[PDB]
UniProtKB/Swiss-Prot annotation, chain A:
Lineage, highest ranks first: Bacteria, Pseudomonadati, Pseudomonadota, Gammaproteobacteria, Oceanospirillales
Keyword Magnesium belongs to the record: yes
Name of the protein: D-galactonate dehydratase family member ManD
Enzyme class, UniProt record, top EC level: lyase
Protein function: Has low dehydratase activity with D-mannonate and D-gluconate, suggesting that these are not physiological substrates and that it has no significant role in the in vivo degradation of these compounds. Has no detectable activity with a panel of 70 other acid sugars (in vitro).
Reactions listed under catalytic activity: D-mannonate = 2-dehydro-3-deoxy-D-gluconate + H2O; D-gluconate = 2-dehydro-3-deoxy-D-gluconate + H2O
Gene: manD
Active site residues of this protein: H194
Residues that bind substrate: N37, H122, E244, R265, H294, D298, E321
GO MF, one example: magnesium ion binding
Cofactor note: Binds 1 Mg(2+) ion per subunit.
Known cofactor(s): Mg(2+)
Organism whose genome encodes this protein: Chromohalobacter salexigens (strain ATCC BAA-138 / DSM 3043 / CIP 106854 / NCIMB 13768 / 1H11)
Amino acid sequence: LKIRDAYTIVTCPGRNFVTLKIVTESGTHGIGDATLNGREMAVAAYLDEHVVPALIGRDAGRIEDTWQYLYRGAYWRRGPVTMTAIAAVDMALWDIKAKAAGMPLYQLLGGKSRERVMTYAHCTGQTIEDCLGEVARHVELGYRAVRVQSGVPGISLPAEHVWSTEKYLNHAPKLFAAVRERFGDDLHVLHDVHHRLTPIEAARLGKAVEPYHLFWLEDCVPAENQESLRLIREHTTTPLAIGEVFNSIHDCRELIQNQWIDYIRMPLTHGGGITAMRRVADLASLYHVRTGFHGPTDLSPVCLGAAIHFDTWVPNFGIQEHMPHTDETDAVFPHDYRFEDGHFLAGESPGHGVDIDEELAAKYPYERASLPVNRLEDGTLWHW
Amino acid sequence: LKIRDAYTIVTCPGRNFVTLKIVTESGTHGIGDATLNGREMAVAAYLDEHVVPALIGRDAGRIEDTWQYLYRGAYWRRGPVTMTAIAAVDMALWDIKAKAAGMPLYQLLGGKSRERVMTYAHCTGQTIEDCLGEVARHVELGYRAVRVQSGVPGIETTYGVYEPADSSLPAEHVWSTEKYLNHAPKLFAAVRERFGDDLHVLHDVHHRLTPIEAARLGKAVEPYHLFWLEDCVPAENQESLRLIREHTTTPLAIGEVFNSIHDCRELIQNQWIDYIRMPLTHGGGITAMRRVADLASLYHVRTGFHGPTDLSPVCLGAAIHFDTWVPNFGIQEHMPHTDETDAVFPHDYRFEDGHFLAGESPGHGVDIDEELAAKYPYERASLPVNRLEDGTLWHW
Ligand SMILES: [Mg+2]
Ligand SMILES: [Mg+2]
């Protein structure tokens, strides 16, 4: 199990993905997701030039040692590029270890804690009515949970969006009222605030939406300063989720220990892989916090498969976001996880159950694509 | 004046440097340091593929807007690659602004607060005696302050005993905390015995201790009155400094591995450190570091910018301008660059009698000679790792 080859693959079967492959002398291989949306080539370079050469000859079985070697050894610690590179290695090594053990990953982690993995779907629309149409559509597909978003009346390179907080705050509660009126109380309803509020504005929104009993209100405020959550938590009983933009337990230790959130959203690809996220989930468990992994299209099927395995074992599972990948993406990344009746089921193949078709990946060259930015009506560069 | 062109230059005149150059429609230009030791190409790619294209056509005068656009706009916030890229842009834009203003950078920032900026030199040796020899020679050169490091008997290799990134793949060092703790105070005792009390004496613990171990070391070295004890413990958990601060009056310095005000807000507000070490090229540039220095000032914390060979003369020049203006200046680290490096980056900052003097040329006073830079191709070099005697991957 000494490493004989390690290299990245960059491919764009509908959107960009970066993948790390590690191959042992014996021939067993593992893959890990290294995709960082809108900054993809920074991770590719971090891996190609600085990490991959150091992997050659290392014992692939030494997962923990390798994690610490890359984390501490980089000298400059934490960060999105850094932790995604480390996550990619970690995911590939856990893939290899599960294969060597002849077990699907969830078994190697401690076995199954649940029989299936609940997901939510994205329901979006220009008007509230448009959104309700999407909710009905996804309910018919078997989803037990939906994230709802609608437009606010009056509202390659980064697209430039315009934002008004005050108009959003007045309008948003009407969406949830309408969802409850049409679909009733049994449906789980989620909403993503996407970083745009100040804490007292989020406190106001949280209170306003209490009657509609949201599964969570997500990313209320930028949280580099973790104390930003305090005012929200002290003013509302609407459950709170945060963390898709985090990469370290150190981004959320205080959020969790002070009981300022209900769900932690940091995913495998950006959170330093299985090794690190086990520790985050375990810390969360002490405070009744549950996992809600970020699961957008910009995390590859490699992350999704590993996440479904993790979701299957972890005691404090909350929910798994599902944004379906394109057929082309699924073809590039064959996998054995299944979606049925609104839930994922983990694969039984040894490893995390995902592979990459390198020949096919090579047919979809990288295409630069950036995330949007958001400005206030006066032009102020805001949070998107 | 809009940005017409922006590009990186990668050169290795003794070691790797990455530089960002921004050129306006009028031809005026600015440069910023983008060097992240041992991970250089990650920053190069971040800039080349993802930042540079978005700079074209922007108003070069909109420094704040650009900083926010890149920081918030990246979506994934903070981190060494991210903030070094942003720092490079920021430094280049301030360079351009100062040139447009016809002023050296320190003037643009608020004018000079001091007539010279005190530095410290690195004194190192295998034995204590070897180190003392180095102190003697640096005192002779006019340094008012020295950092001292020496070998630990029974340990083959220790930090600072010199170009850390000296191998293609990481060198592997071995470490014993207990041997270091019993030996280190002997060094400082020897330095005071030979050189007396007026000299400022610094020491870098380089991340290797736990908090209570650093508390013990701090107490043990109180009699020697160190200027600072640096990087005692890894500080991703900022609370790691608390036990040290509660147990010793030896001054503490931290932060060369930080990149964000959010890495040190609590260290500062709780008064757990005396000097903040985060430098311009890794800490988001002038725009961000002004904010950090100002927060620090409310709590009597002073600046002590990291200044190793792996920050280019572009950073050093900009840092000297910053140091010249900032009220709560502490000290500026000086590790001399190679002749080849100084030639690639012509500059107007000066070193005299143990102090830096800021340049008077408009901008930060540093330029890059691209034809000369092209003579020195990138060569991979990685920082070492450190393992305990039992093989445990530790902190280097
Ligand atoms: Mg979200
Ligand atoms: Mg240091």
